[PDB]
Design a protein around this ligand. Sequence first.
Ligand SMILES: [C][C][C][C][C][C][C][C][C][C][C][C][C][C][C]C(=O)O[C][C]([O])[C]OP([O])(=O)O[C][C]N([C])([C])[C]
Ligand SMILES: [C][C][C][C][C][C][C][C][C][C][C][C][C][C][C]C(=O)O[C][C]([O])[C]OP([O])(=O)O[C][C]N([C])([C])[C]
Ligand SMILES: [C][C][C][C][C][C][C][C][C][C][C][C][C][C][C]C(=O)O[C][C]([O])[C]OP([O])(=O)O[C][C]N([C])([C])[C]
Ligand SMILES: [Cl-]
Ligand code: NA
Ligand code: NA
Ligand SMILES: [Zn+2]
Lengths: 83, 79, 75, 76
Amino acid sequence: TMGQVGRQLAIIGDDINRRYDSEFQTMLQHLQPTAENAYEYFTKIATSLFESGINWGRVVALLGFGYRLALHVYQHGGSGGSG
Amino acid sequence: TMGQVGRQLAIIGDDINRRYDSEFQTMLQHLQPTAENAYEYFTKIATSLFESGINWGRVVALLGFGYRLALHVYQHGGS
Amino acid sequence: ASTKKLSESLKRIGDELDSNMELQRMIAAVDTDSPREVFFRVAADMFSDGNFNWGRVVALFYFASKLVLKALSTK
Amino acid sequence: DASTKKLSESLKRIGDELDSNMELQRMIAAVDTDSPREVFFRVAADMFSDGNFNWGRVVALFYFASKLVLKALSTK
Ligand SMILES: [C][C][C][C][C][C][C][C][C][C][C][C][C][C][C]C(=O)O[C][C]([O])[C]OP([O])(=O)O[C][C]N([C])([C])[C]
Ligand SMILES: [C][C][C][C][C][C][C][C][C][C][C][C][C][C][C]C(=O)O[C][C]([O])[C]OP([O])(=O)O[C][C]N([C])([C])[C]
Ligand SMILES: [C][C][C][C][C][C][C][C][C][C][C][C][C][C][C]C(=O)O[C][C]([O])[C]OP([O])(=O)O[C][C]N([C])([C])[C]
Ligand SMILES: [Cl-]
Ligand code: NA
Ligand code: NA
Ligand SMILES: [Zn+2]
């Protein structure tokens, strides 16, 4: 049927999701309440990751978490207060 | 009347290219000859920028420069 | 070898992308469900005149990165 | 807005799988018959055509798509 490549990529994604379940679950545990808190935290993880050395895949994974942070703020953004 | 947004976005891009000509030129001045030379320098510029604080636009510009390095390797040096 | 000049250059480009009201208005006008088809169109329409520069690329990076955000807001 | 050790390790393992995944690399190399724009257009919808979503599919799509941008740029 149509979309064999997309399905293959969907299968590969499901496998990655399956094998690294804990790694993705860890991404849901550092959500930030505001854009400023997300930019701060995104910077801290990015800085740590680059200090450990990076490859193309690591930059892609970093941006994956970044969109997880952005999506949380974009749908459920707070307004400071907790400090 | 077909392709207005795309052409509108192209106009903004051209204006950005003109106003920040010197800035884009600085990107070409720091091109790298190999993949790992690109990953090292990309690391140093990213960490330097991150030390100054970032917003969405600043990350996009960093990834813009990242693709500038990447494209140069994916075409020339390091064949 | 040296990054401070490049760093400030990236700050200036990025801040224009982040504060350009016209760009933000275009991103907000492509709500209404379908970021996938809008990117498909803009990506080609942007280079229909045969010109290329990295001002267009980063503008497309910014525009596209915001459509990914919207797309994720449905699923 | 602080603890990062565990997340960093998680991103290293996910990122390293993507960077060394031979199948993903083979797929990226199999669509070198031009229009990376149209392939992305197709795979982006086809990979979520079953109504499922997870961030393994997202990062797989990010990786595959980020390589098509490189190829797209290699045409000028
Ligand atoms: C490849 C090429 C392209 C590239 C792309 C990538 C980039 C990076 C990303 C990640 C980043 C992450 C961090 C941040 C998060 C948050 O918060 O987020 C939210 C939103 O929403 C944003 O916020 P803000 O900024 O604050 O906002 C803006 C404006 N408005 C309108 C939204 C308010
Ligand atoms: C939105 C999300 C999506 C995802 C993300 C996007 C962005 C990315 C980051 C930047 C990237 C960084 C820059 C540098 C690198 C380079 O160099 O490059 C070149 C070649 O071409 C490449 O290199 P490599 O890859 O490493 O090599 C090839 C591969 N193999 C297979 C050969 C190993
Ligand atoms: C999921 C996630 C994922 C999503 C996101 C991503 C984004 C990306 C964007 C970027 C893209 C860019 C590339 C393109 C280039 C061009 O131009 O292409 C056409 C040709 O063909 C062109 O051609 P012409 O125009 O004809 O010619 C050229 C000119 N010169 C001057 C350069 C020679
Ligand atoms: Cl946003
Ligand atoms: Na916990
Ligand atoms: Na700790
Ligand atoms: Zn949320």
